[PDB]
């Protein structure tokens, strides 16, 4: 069982919110004919280049071809090599060894004829709670469309949501107000994002004045810049709510670790480089006695159904998680996109060997795009995900 | 797919030092004729009482009867939450977590038609260099026999050794000594292992005189108490060789890289509670970015092939292991024992389904023993693994 | 006066070692007439990625058009914005931000009729010692060959060297042995370079025993992972020699001075994103009383040049420095290469406005190259630079 | 280019506190006739002795006959040779590099033609939000006086004010009271500074019980001893509201950063030697990613003019700033002052070249003083800058 081939296909799919991201779908063949896909998700964040994905395919092929696609572990190993850790969030190289390593996943599962689900462990449970995004507000005239988003969601079935804030606390504090007065206790916002926006102090003031508002608060995500270790640590120690960071790099989260800096650790194949590395953080966390939720950079029907497989194995995801990115896409690039009901994503049906999902080669040629280039988008709105 | 029944088999098997060892294999029945085979590999060490099979048996049968074996994940946790992990490198029920799930890995590798490697994440290596194993001396008189074992293991091949040092250290001196002398270069002793003998000032002493001799030396080994980190950390600073220590639990584990107390983990299914225990940990260890070794409590066959597919599956180890079992015991309970050349340690053939062993039923019946209790024997012996 | 237009010019050009490396010249384009050239030096370094330059121009020129030059912390800040520092090593935003900034002072200089030095505080100094590099032997057969380009470069003027260890202690060792026995103290190794390939203790271990060899040792760089500041504090205790690191990021920066980790600082434009960039490390280190010496990615004459104006305007550079691009690389894309004499980089004449080089067109075509895609290299050759 | 001659123009121009004020106004010439001039601002700071003028220029000339005004980097060593930090706020001897240190600047621009901003690194905004001072009170009878000082300049346009507490806590109390009765939220008080003059815990009680005032509160200003970082740290950690303290020396602000002591680094040129000294610590603060604020001791135009550039040149100045020295003296030494408008300190016109101010003759004569003797005052007076 070798691999003979790779194809990468590149599209643009836009949110309801009006922000477009691309993507890049996998396809990785072999000599008996079976294929796995996968995805690398959301190429669409800093740094402001792109990846040629002609050459990325040579680079791909030359370390894929005539390997064994059970060899996880080995190619992880090369894929790393090639594509280093960063210690950077949104590490293009992350999001590529993701859509390899998912796509190896789909296509060892298919080989075998069992679901992903049961080539990573089984299952704990067979959905995980979710929650939809609120992005953050700038200004105040922004939070009466954002309440519409809450009172649509909810009918829909989402009854869990998360506030990015720290750019306009009084909009931020203004939205809270208007939710909790609304809806009472029927909406829950499990958590107030900074997006490492804030220096630690600043965001325990800011944390200070919004968690006045506890609508079923479940953490504060993100509550310091990126790998201030130290600043993490000592929010911690003064917020009664778990502080929560995601885990872009190994040595990033063996220092939150060792530190003791964190609560939950929000890991999400994407950002670290496949299924086989978010195992691995997964597992760390484990050996750590430390609680996980599943993040999201919002991919598509085969990025989040890699995930919900992955999702619904842990024994250690006691929080709501956050991928919603089929809801939050207007479009998709396969037959049938993942589950959700009652604010739950549903792993694939068990049954169906792979990741459970199938492309669609016209949705592929609809949201086809040449390649990976940037439109025009500001600092701000690539930051907030906002148009 | 469901699990049916359970069986276990208890034997003894002497060694060649004339230690004798009672193991349990296991044998996991499913509904469609299945059967997965495992090992509780040597619960001959302290503390000196020994566990009911027939009661041991109905509360892993309670707990595995009609579940899915593909569930590890699941199963694992379940296991643990009724064998909790107590922070003791002998715990009892690690060895008896462990007979369960490598038993698990065999059955479900068996249904999918594939090697055990495969379902581990397929390998990195086709072998894993070990070491033939020398007990400490209590007295001086015992080195000559020692010598030839040395003598006789390296003309099968086995070119390192390790060395149970810290009772005697002018006899452990006096071994290492002629040892150099008689083979000069041709014999590495890749360790020198304490066994957590002595305090880590005492062992930094022992471990400056015995260093006098380097033939190869890798590590060494448990140079402090149970669980003093804060030794194994100041020893760590204090020696320049890579200082190793056994992964008996997360916790323990955790806190070890917490204080970046050793170099290299040793880590080994039967300590830890099975394969996929053994798995978080390791990664736990990449995650780290430290060196782990594949450690030993000497098991049969069936227990070493299982510790081979993980050994082979590992990204970091880099120096030389220490399972040869097989090699040490008078006799096994399978048709074809794993294989050892060169002082190597090959993983099963690739294309057997499975562990890739077979247990030989009258093996079984010549080396039954009607349960675990325990002989005459003492401490001295129970420690040094002597008689 | 404001930017009206950029052009990147793509170029690949050979290392007398075999290495071909693929650098960017900048021009920067006024409304009156006046054009910065600059130069984001060696794209050659993992990740095995390429950035697509058509992009990529689009993404700078819409951060760019309309400004004014001289808004120099204006334009760094939002050049940082749009390409975030990630904490790696290479980074090929800051290699694109370092040429953005380097054009920028060319500019201004230009305008002024002043050199860069004189834009940059003037000078302390009129040239600086620097030292050819001899890459990493991996095997003992490649030791003779470095000899010859020791015999060689010194008949030419450069009396020290520095080299590259960590893969072949025995041929890092030999090569070392060889040096002292041929030329005595006629040449000098200022530092062993690990290049961050192995954890602290294990650099302990070849630090001992590489520095029985002192040809004139002035550091030791690089000799644990990347951002292991507790590693390199430790070490800094261990050893007598200094010990240095790249800075690659204000934060990794921040961290290695809040713990003490070194006691040189290796600042280089490319690595931190420009001479702006360049000259805030450079000021954090004075203020903290850090001793700095003038890193390298190995650049084009016009990467020089800004690095040499640059080097001889600050105060604590106390130790020999590694720029010797323009000496390794077979061509250039100037008119006049920037000047070695002695072992000294001589910084451009300062009666030149500007950078004080010039851009040869036909040169510029000869090197042209199509794109960044990468051609076949391994990954040791990515890591040593060897061919 | 050389300077050839330096002229130091001692001058006493009181408040309208009544305190009175020496400053020294510089003139340093070339050989093509270029002037720059400069200020050793306000040398009315204890300790209570006063430097000989007749010989400071002769130390000067020394340095500085000959050199090029272009090389900063090394005159500003060779004037920190002869004039060392000392750790100490008011050492009369970087009031002396910061005056040569701002003429050099105002020397090179108009050299080159150029505004000092553009000298600096452009502009990132074109005026600084400032603060008027209310200088503390020791009685409760002085009270009515300053809430005059308020209601007056809020008419003139200053609506931020900063309040000097710690010797009377319940004057300062009263004050704060009375001020948020009679202009509700008209007027912010951005800042209480203690001026070293508490040890941390009392400063503690003070903050807590004055804090019930928070009037658009932005910072709490030396609220420890000098140099006491330990105490800085823990003070920071028990206040919510940000801690800045001054910067005098590199070591001091090493310290603060390496300790993590500060929030908010209060950095201006005539306590930490001039504009190229207060640059240096800016990028400092800013490679250690501290906020900044833009500090004072109340200077004339040129000096007021000299800090207004490198204010409007930095990235991280997020509060308000307290420069007001030409609103708070009565007379000036210029042509036209520096100009405030709605509490906003503005950058001098960015088309004049050098610092854009011109000293008028006659006002330097009008407030020529001998010498910088001391005149009657007391230690409280010169903490307090009352009268
Ligand atoms: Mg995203
Ligand atoms: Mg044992
Ligand atoms: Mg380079
Ligand atoms: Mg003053």
């Known amino acids: 069982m070798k691999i003979t081939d790779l194809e990468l296909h590149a599209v643009g799919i836009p949110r309801h919110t009006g922000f477009v991201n691309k993507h890049v779908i996998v396809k990785i063949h072999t000599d008996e004919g079976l294929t796995g896909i996968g ?33 996880l572990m ?17 590490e293009k190289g992350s999001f590529i060894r993701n859509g390899i390593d998912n796509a190896l996943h789909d296509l060892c599962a298919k080989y075998l004829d069992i679901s992903v689900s049961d080539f990573l462990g089984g299952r704990v449970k067979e959905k995980i709670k979710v929650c939809y995004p609120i992005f953050r507000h700038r200004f105040s005239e922004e939070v009466e469309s954002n309440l519409d988003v809450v009172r649509q969601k909810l009918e829909q079935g989402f009854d869990v949501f998360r506030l990015y804030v720290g750019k306009n606390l009084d909009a931020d504090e203004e ?18 994002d900074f997006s490492h926006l804030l220096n630690w102090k600043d965001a325990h003031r800011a944390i200070k004045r919004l968690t006045k508002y506890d609508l079923g608060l479940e953490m504060i995500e993100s509550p310091a810049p990126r790998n201030d270790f130290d600043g993490l640590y000592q929010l911690r120690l003064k917020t009664d ?21 964190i609560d939950i650790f929000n890991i999400s194949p994407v950002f670290i480089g496949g299924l086989t590395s978010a ?8 050996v750590a006695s430390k609680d996980v939720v599943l993040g999201t950079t919002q991919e598509l029907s085969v990025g989040t159904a890699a995930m919900a497989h992955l999702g619904c194995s842990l024994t250690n995801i006691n929080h709501t998680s956050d991928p919603t990115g089929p809801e939050l896409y207007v479009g998709d690039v396969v037959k049938n996109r993942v589950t959700y009901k009652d604010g739950y994503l549903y792993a694939p049906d068990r049954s169906v060997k792979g990741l459970g999902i199938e492309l669609d080669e016209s949705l592929l040629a609809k949201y086809q795009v040449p390649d990976l280039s940037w439109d025009n988008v500001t600092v701000h709105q690539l930051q907030d995900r906002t148009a």
Chains 1, 2, 3, 4 share one sequence.
């Open 279 to 286: 195992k691995k953080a997964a597992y760390a966390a484990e």
């Open 175 to 192: 939205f809270l107000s208007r939710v909790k007065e609304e809806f009472g206790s029927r909406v829950r916002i499990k958590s107030y």
């Open 39 to 71: 995805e690398m998700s959301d190429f669409s964040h800093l740094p402001l280049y792109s990846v040629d994905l002609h050459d990325l395919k040579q680079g791909l092929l030359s370390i894929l071809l005539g390997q064994n696609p059970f060899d």
């Open 74 to 90: 080995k190619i992880n190993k090369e894929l790393t090599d090639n594509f280093p850790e960063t210690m950077y969030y949104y």
């Open 241 to 261: 709510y778990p502080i929560s960071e995601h885990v872009w790099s190994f040595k990033q989260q063996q220092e939150m670790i060792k530190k003791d800096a």
